[PDB]
Amino acid sequence: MFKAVLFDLDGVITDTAEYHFRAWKALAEEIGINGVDRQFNEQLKGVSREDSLQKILDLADKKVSAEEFKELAKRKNDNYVKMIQDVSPADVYPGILQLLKDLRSNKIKIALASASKNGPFLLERMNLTGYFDAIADPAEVAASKPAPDIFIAAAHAVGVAPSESIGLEDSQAGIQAIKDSGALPIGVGRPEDLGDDIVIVPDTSHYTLEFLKEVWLQ
Numbered sequence: 001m002f003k004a005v006l007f008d009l010d011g012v013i014t015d016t017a018e019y020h021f022r023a024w025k026a027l028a029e030e031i032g033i034n035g036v037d038r039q040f041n042e043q044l045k046g047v048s049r050e051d052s053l054q055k056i057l058d059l060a061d062k063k064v065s066a067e068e069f070k071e072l073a074k075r076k077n078d079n080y081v082k083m084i085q086d087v088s089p090a091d092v093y094p095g096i097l098q099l100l101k102d103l104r105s106n107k108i109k110i111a112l113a114s115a116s117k118n119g120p121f122l123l124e125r126m127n128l129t130g131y132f133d134a135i136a137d138p139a140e141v142a143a144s145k146p147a148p149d150i151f152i153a154a155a156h157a158v159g160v161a162p163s164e165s166i167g168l169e170d171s172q173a174g175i176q177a178i179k180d181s182g183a184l185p186i187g188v189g190r191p192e193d194l195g196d197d198i199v200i201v202p203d204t205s206h207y208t209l210e211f212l213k214e215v216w217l218q
C-alpha cells in the first residue's frame with residue numbers, strides 16, 4: 001500500500017491557483033503583455049515565481065533589466081500576499097480536510113510539495129499545518145517543477161520512497177515532476193489540460209482515501 005501522499009497546494013488544497021492567475025495577469029498587463037489568459041496560465045501552474053515571470057516575458061519576447069525583473073517578481077508577490085490575507089479554513093477545497101484526517105488515522109505520511117514560498121502561511125490560514133508531517137521548502141530545492149526534485153524531497157522528509165507515494169497535482173509541470181520522481185500521480189482538473197495518460201479527477205471531492213486505494217490497486 002502507498003505510505004505517503006505528497007500534496008501540491010495551489011489548485012489542490014484550495015483555490016489559490018486562481019489567485020496566482022489573477023495576480024500574474026495584472027502584472028503582465030501593467031507591462032503591456034496581454035497574453036496571460038487561462039490557457040497560457042496552464043504553463044504557470046506549479047512553476048517557480050521567477051520561472052513564471054520569465055515565461056510571461058518570453059511570451060512577448062520582452063527584455064527587462066535584472067533590476068526590473070527583481071522588482072516585477074516582488075510586485076506580483078506583494079499583490080498576491082495581500083490577496084490571500086483573508087483565506088480561512090472555509091476555503092479548504094471539498095474532500096481535503098477529511099482526506100488528511102483519514103490518512104493520519106491510517107498512518108500514511110503527509111508532505112507538502114508546493115513551489116510556493118507562501119505555502120506555510122496558507123496552511124496556517126487554513127488550520128492545516130498540524131496535518132503535515134513535512135513541508136519541502138522550495139527555497140531549498142533549486143530545480144522547479146517539472147523537475148522531480150521537490151517531490152523527491154517531500155518523500156524523503158517523511159522517510160518514504162517516492163515509488164511508495166502518491167502525488168496530487170493540478171498542473172502540467174507538477175504531473176511531469178511526479179512521474180519523474182517515481183511517485184504515482186492523480187491529477188485534478190480537465191483532461192484537455194492535464195492529459196489522458198494518468199488518472200485525472202474533475203474536482204477534489206474525488207480525493208478520498210477509498211479512491212486513492214482504488215487507484216493504487218489499479
Ligand SMILES: O=P(O)(O)C[C@@H]1O[C@H](CO)[C@@H](O)[C@H](O)[C@H]1O
Pocket residue numbers: 009010020044045046047048049052077114115116117118119
Ligand atoms: O508563491 P510563489 O513563491 O510566488 C510560487 C508560485 O507557485 C505557484 C504554484 O504553487 C505558481 O503557479 C505561481 O506561478 C508561483 O508564483
Ligand SMILES: [Mg+2]
Pocket residue numbers: 008009010011012017045046169170171174
Ligand atoms: Mg498547483
